[PDB]
Design a protein around this ligand. Sequence first.
Ligand SMILES: CCCCCCCC/C=C/CCCCCCCC(=O)OC[C@H](COP(=O)(O)OCCN)OC(=O)CCCCCCC/C=C/CCCCCCCC
Ligand SMILES: *P(=O)(O)OCC(C)(C)[C@H](O)C(=O)NCCC(=O)NCCSC(=O)CCCCCCCCCCCCC
Lengths: 459, 67, 128, 55, 87, 125, 110, 80, 103, 178, 110
Amino acid sequence: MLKIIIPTTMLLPMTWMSKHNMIWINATVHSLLISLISLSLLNQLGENSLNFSLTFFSDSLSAPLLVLTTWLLPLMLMASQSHLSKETTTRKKLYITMLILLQLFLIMTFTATELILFYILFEATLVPTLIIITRWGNQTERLNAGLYFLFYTLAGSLPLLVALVYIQNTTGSLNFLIIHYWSHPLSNSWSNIFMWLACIMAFMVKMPLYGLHLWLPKAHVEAPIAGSMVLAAVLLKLGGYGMMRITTILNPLTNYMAYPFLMLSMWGMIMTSSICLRQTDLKSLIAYSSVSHMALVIVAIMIQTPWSFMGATALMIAHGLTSSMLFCLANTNYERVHSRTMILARGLQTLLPLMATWWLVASLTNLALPPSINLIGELFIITASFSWSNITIILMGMNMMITALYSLYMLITTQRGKYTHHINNIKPSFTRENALMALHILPLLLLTLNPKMILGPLY
Amino acid sequence: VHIEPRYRQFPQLTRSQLIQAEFFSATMWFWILWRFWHDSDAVLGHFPYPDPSQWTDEELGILPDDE
Amino acid sequence: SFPKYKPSRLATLPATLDPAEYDISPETRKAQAERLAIRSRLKREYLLQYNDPNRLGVIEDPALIRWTYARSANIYPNFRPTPKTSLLGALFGIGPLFFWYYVFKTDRDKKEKLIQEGKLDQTFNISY
Amino acid sequence: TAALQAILYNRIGDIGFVLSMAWFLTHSNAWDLQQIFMLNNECPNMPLIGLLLAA
Amino acid sequence: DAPPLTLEAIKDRVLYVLKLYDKIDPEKLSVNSHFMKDLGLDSLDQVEIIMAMEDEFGFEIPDIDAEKLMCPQEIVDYIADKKDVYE
Amino acid sequence: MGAHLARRYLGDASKEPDPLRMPTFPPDYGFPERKEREMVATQQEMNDAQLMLQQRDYCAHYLIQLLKCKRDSFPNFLACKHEQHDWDYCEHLDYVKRMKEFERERRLLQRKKRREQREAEMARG
Amino acid sequence: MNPFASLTLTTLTILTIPIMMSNSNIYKTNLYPNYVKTTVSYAFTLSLVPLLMFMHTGQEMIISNWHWMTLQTVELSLSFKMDYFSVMFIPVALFVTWSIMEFSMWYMHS
Amino acid sequence: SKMELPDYKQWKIEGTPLETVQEKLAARGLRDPWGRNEAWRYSGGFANNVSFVGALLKGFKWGFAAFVVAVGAEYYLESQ
Amino acid sequence: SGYTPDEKLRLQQLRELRRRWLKDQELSPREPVLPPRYKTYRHSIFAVTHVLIPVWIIHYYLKYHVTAKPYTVVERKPRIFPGDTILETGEVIPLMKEFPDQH
Amino acid sequence: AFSAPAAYLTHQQKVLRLYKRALRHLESWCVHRDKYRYFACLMRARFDEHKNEKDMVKATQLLRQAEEEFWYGQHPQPYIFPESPGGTSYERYECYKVPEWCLDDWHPSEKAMYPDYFAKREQWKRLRRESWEREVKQLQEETPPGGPRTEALPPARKEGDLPPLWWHIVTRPRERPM
Amino acid sequence: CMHAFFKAMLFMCSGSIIHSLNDEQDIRKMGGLYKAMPFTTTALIIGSLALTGMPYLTGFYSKDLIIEAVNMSYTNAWALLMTLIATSLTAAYSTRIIFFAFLGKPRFPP
Ligand SMILES: CCCCCCCC/C=C/CCCCCCCC(=O)OC[C@H](COP(=O)(O)OCCN)OC(=O)CCCCCCC/C=C/CCCCCCCC
Ligand SMILES: *P(=O)(O)OCC(C)(C)[C@H](O)C(=O)NCCC(=O)NCCSC(=O)CCCCCCCCCCCCC
């Protein structure tokens, strides 16, 4: 994994030694090169994972997330160069450095072979994100959003650290291969119940679980465009990856401790879709859509079947791409009119045609339209939940109906209708914005063409 | 063909559309009459419906009540 | 005479059938004039800013800002824990959870009982 | 409004369709007509009502 | 599709309708004659005239605007302005 | 539709036949010597012709002949009138046999009612 | 090879063809409606041919040309069931669409 | 081009149901002044119209003749 | 009840301005200044490409790739009637028995 | 839509609007022209019967009774003109209406494609920019110190002036833009 | 198949009427089109006759068999009665369309 880690640690000096007018060009070009290099990890084995060394390893679950991170970095660079034109050169370099550090920590997190190193890195992802939010956010609420995000995540994660050190003391190793080959059943006792609670609650807060999600609207709405893109695409997937990795040793206690979390996830998925139906803010609408999708992923992981894990992985990748695209579209419209109210700007279908096409495609992918990988993952999760029980179909159907309703409501409100009469600063869409949308959408359709690359180890 | 608009008057028609409408209506009625002539059993039926009250107990296998 | 029309919540009373429209006090006319004056002042401000040749941007709407602020940020500071709020919150945030837990637990208990008794049609059920 | 209404009603139909698809996969290990017809010698109410709702 | 309207066509059609009205003598009817002052009609007659023009031209004139159309020339100008007729 | 529905519903269901339970009497009850129905087409022939299982009744041979005639004279889709009429006539005969069965069931039921009424009267006397 | 599968898949592909031409000067000009209508008519005739094939011998087939993915013991592949229903509905739908597209060339001129 | 409106003096309610309406109103003591403006519809080429049964028999005249000719041709061909 | 003099004057002025604006909206004889840069023949060129090339590609794909793995293309077995000739083995499927003919 | 509304509807305006609405719904009921003419003449006879009334209280009572009768007897599916708010062709062309501020963002090549139109557009823009100060001064001169009590706007009181707040009224998109 | 044919033709005739009468979709405003528009009139009459089950048109070979199967099967009595009433109401609304669109005097703008 050093052939991918070291190029980022070289991107840092490149950013800090480039000329003032070439920082964005250099960062984008070399981020795309690093993504191309990281595409090699998709060649996975059918029996075991790719164990590079004693510290880093790659799996059919880690590879798509790493590729998504490496592909997402240049898009964040494009959006940031859009909205940071008046900043000084030093602050531009600092912003690029924060993005690079976040990507490096995410790569090391997804490739870490030991639970304690994984914990250290996935906690280290907070600092660049908090700095980005609380420093380059636009509104007054960025400080409160950062506080909420940081303290929710840390209150979740500290008992996870205690549980990890206790597991190390009890068993002798936190290496994932060792804890998988030497896994032993977890007897039904209060101590095991609380260990299960510590681990699962940390990752549920990271997911986020319904009832533990307020930090997500707070942070996503108030963060800059790059922060919003990375929060939804990758940082939300740390919880799912951790739960997939950590549930090896939690059986058979997961068969009994999953009921409250399953009920919370299903009913909160319904509730957050309904909230999306009546949202006066576009970023809030997208954030609650993210909450619903991650609640579905939580349901899949908790029911814990080979068919659910594949759907969970596919839904994670598809939701990451779709949420990044939706946040980018909302940011473009915000840069037009300097306000996040959804009904302020209308008639954008007749004011900006190709951007309306991008909106339509993003909304179509947001709802499960076949044969998109969104639909593939959602359908796999729905079928696994149907096998689990036969009223999960009722809940999933209600969620799908409300999902289509709010997606098309957002599309119609933002695009259809008649344009606002007094808004006359909506310039034609930039080549940069259109290229950003194209780079968001085309990989989604290519992954639809080749679906087995994002179905996880269980395929 | 250029058709001038009329004001409060019957519109200008064309011999082509007149004869086409007449031809297709005549075609429909000719087809209906021709079909009713040849296979009339498609409307009136072909096989008589038996009257079960006229079937005898001998052929229906019903013995005398006293026996 | 003719059957009466009963207004509802989702089918309101028509203006022509409102009894208040046929009992017009001189105070009502003054109130209507005041409302028209308020609307005219707002319309004049909007039209001036809208027809200004040098304006390039969005005319900020304080009413829209107040609406979006009240819908989002001004809810919690004005929330007081009352019996009505407590009961509604408890119901709408707990009852569905326990209801679905009961439903799914009963369903899974029946399924497990059938599996243990060995009289459940599990043939061809390969994928799970 | 008409477009969104059509989407809503067809999405309830899709709820039924997804119910039928999930039942067929779980109880027949296939999503194709050949194996569905082979294995379902007496098709049950849940998949058939799902199909009816979708239709 | 349809041929465009003209000021002359609008005026001819409105005068046609008004001359087919039986409470107006066509000889003393001109494009500037007022319905009330110099034609001798009343509010109900004006409402009927506006409804007749709505039927003639296939579009509805709102009641707030219909009350002020007191002249055939005013009706012509209103209809031309709404239909974007400039020649 | 029909008078039988009226008789059974607004009347004596005991004297009217049950369509789901018919026949309720032995096939030879009243028939001293009764002949089994003759099937012309064999199971292998019907399977090769791939007749629908709804179409594999006692009139299957005429259907097979009609299909063979239709396949051979493809462009002339009006050359199978005789075969179609033969198949329809066989189906008509099958239907009138079913009608005879219904009528036999009805009159046997009312005969049984008369017999049991007479026996009850004899016991009462 | 039997012309059945080839002709059916060809009708479907030639239906798809004018969409690939939607990023061209023909899509920019005013010949696109007539182009689409002509393509639909050609597809209609090319689909009438397998209907003639079925009306004679009653041929029905399934075409699982491309294998999409194998989910453990469940294989999903791009399969087309060319049976009586398909070979009878396709020519009717194509005929109706051809007529509708010409009527739309007249009706949607403006 | 430059269509001309037909002379307005030709529109008369006479011979049309509007005259019957006018007679009823006169018996009531009333009059309708918009008689002619509606009377354009009842004259010209719209004066004669077909009933519903007549509309369905639009091509029955020629259809029956063609059917008779075809039946005769078929009979003659069958005979010889 | 009618236009006030101010309303009528403003309406007249606005109508004049609107008509002038529309007249200006009218184009010029040379206005779209563009930058420098048989029926059977068209039917034949369309038919060869749009029909001939795809059918060639599809037949090549089916004959040599799709019909190279088992069960990809499965034809329903032909219907066999009595009194027929099976072509593969030169077999004679025999006739049915005599019918109890009615009239 | 072109007239500024008043603070209230007078009794005459109310009864005239009721008359027109009742005639329209009666025409919806009486499809045929002669029948509609007959019943419309009867309706106008009723209105003439109640035309002269010295007691305004009784006139208002009669108006209320007539409104109740109309609401009971209205056509559930009345005729609406296609361009009217309830019509089938209402707001169909609102997506084709594009403004001149969108127009002025064109590329120089697109502008050069139409040389003569943009010269007149620049003349219009100069006319707009040379009159705004006069328009706003005229508006603030005539309005009362309290503020505008109605939405009416004044004409141009001078020979070299344009009526204030005219740009969007004059340059509103055409009824059939594309 | 049969319904596709004749219902598509009926909708096309309705669209032709709408386009001729300047986007007017009200039968209360249509009228006189029997002679105003001959070809669309005869096409709509043929379509309505086929829809209602003219004894030898396209709709006869499906609707008549459907009705016979409904009558001759072990069906729900209420379902059978509602099917018959629906057939009668089909004839009724076809009559309404023809009567208010083609017969009588014009009601469209002059
Ligand atoms: C299984 C899941 C549950 C299924 C039923 C749940 C129904 C939930 C209703 C959805 C809530 C709506 C959220 C927002 C939707 C969009 C807002 C909206 O109301 O749309 C307005 C729009 C406008 O109405 P118009 O008649 O067109 O008038 C226009 C006048 N200008 O109205 C609609 O589109 C709403 C239509 C759906 C409403 C609900 C109706 C569904 C209820 C029927 C369920 C029973 C089905 C029985 C099954 C029978 C087959 C076995
Ligand atoms: P012009 O300014 O001359 O107008 C004269 C007016 C009417 C303004 C008078 O000056 C006036 O105000 N007169 C006194 C007030 C008055 O006339 N009140 C009574 C009028 S309302 C009335 O009489 C209506 C009764 C009949 C119509 C009722 C409508 C109900 C039928 C509709 C059915 C729905 C479908 C047909």
